[PDB]
Amino acid sequence: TCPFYKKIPGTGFTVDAFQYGVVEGCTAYFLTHFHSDHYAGLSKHFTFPVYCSEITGNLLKNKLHVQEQYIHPLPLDTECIVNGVKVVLLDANHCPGAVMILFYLPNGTVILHTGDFRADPSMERSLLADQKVHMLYLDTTYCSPEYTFPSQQEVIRFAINTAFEAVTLNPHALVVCGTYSIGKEKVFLAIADVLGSKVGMSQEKYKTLQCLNIPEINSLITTDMCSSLVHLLPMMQINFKGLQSHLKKCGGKYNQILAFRPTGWTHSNKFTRIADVIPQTKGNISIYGIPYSEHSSYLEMKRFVQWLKPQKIIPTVNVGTWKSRSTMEKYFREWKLEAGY
Ligand code: NI
């Protein structure tokens, strides 16, 4: 049964609520982004309206084969009327096509649902500046001060330089990058760009990338593995046994693999700066784990909420335990007391 925090009071609306069969009274279903935890339940057989971004809409059509009559894309930064209710989609700075949703309720109440998001100061100059928010449904994934990580720009600098050095020292080295869902595309794109290669990948992944409205994408990616010296593999294959196997398949083109695993947070961030990171090495193979997050750090989160000064806050991640729910109310109270709202 659909939980409370996926319902929008006073409306016929739910958010990211596809795995509970027919939800009593829902006249329209909102989808924040194309990640499996959120889209779970959707298929070709779904027959109620779905509202989403354009890019999310391309993925529903081409990857889950949802029928074109039921997909309702909306443009960002635009006031739209849906079943007699005003709504706005805003970029979440999460993965491609990911959005936050502003609802203007008939009774005068105003609701922000973040979906998944990495808070940024640029969000303070959106359509959010212009008015009050009464309830904030919040992505609280890293809501604890021990969760620190560097900026995206710092991580991408490290990866580029790491790659460029190794391949310049050894022209016969192959670079590999792990993936399992959409997001974090910049890692493999930036690396290929400094190396003057296209990125090689499977047909199922090529298809996926074609739905993302990336500029000049056709110049950047390819299905011809042999033409490329930056390869994508599924994340699970990024270990010593999986890579040794993959090297055999390249046929004496390459004598060395350097591989990158994009992770979220890991406990090694409590002690080690990004500059100081080192790889796990076995023979002619090396594997770097790098902390590229598309979710807000603790400080990023704290700033956004303190700026927004919402009247009530509802969490959407880490809700499943009493300890978690308790810890989150304590941080919300300190933030409220520190900023005076
Ligand atoms: Ni997500």
Swiss-Prot record:
Subcellular location: Nucleus
Swiss-Prot/TrEMBL keywords: Cell cycle, Cell division, DNA damage, DNA repair, Hydrolase, Isopeptide bond, Metal-binding, Mitosis, Nucleus, Phosphoprotein, Ubl conjugation, Zinc, Zinc-finger
Family: Belongs to the DNA repair metallo-beta-lactamase (DRMBL) family.
Domain of life: Eukaryota
GO CC aspect terms: fibrillar center; nucleoplasm
Function: May be required for DNA interstrand cross-link repair. Also required for checkpoint mediated cell cycle arrest in early prophase in response to mitotic spindle poisons. Possesses beta-lactamase activity, catalyzing the hydrolysis of penicillin G and nitrocefin. Exhibits no activity towards other beta-lactam antibiotic classes including cephalosporins (cefotaxime) and carbapenems (imipenem).
Any single GO BP term: cell division
Tissues expressed in: Expressed in brain, heart, kidney, liver, pancreas, placenta and skeletal muscle.
UniProt-recorded Gene Ontology molecular function terms: 5'-3' DNA exonuclease activity; beta-lactamase activity; damaged DNA binding; zinc ion binding
Oligomeric form and interacting partners: Binds constitutively to TP53BP1. Binds CDC27, which is itself a component of the anaphase promoting complex (APC). Binds PIAS1.
Major site of localization recorded for this protein: nucleus
Keyword Metal-binding applies: yes
Name of the featured protein: DNA cross-link repair 1A protein
Inducing stimuli: During mitosis. The mRNA encoding this protein contains an internal ribosome entry site (IRES) in its 5'-UTR. This 5'-UTR generally suppresses translation while specifically promoting expression during mitosis, when cap-dependent translation may be impaired.
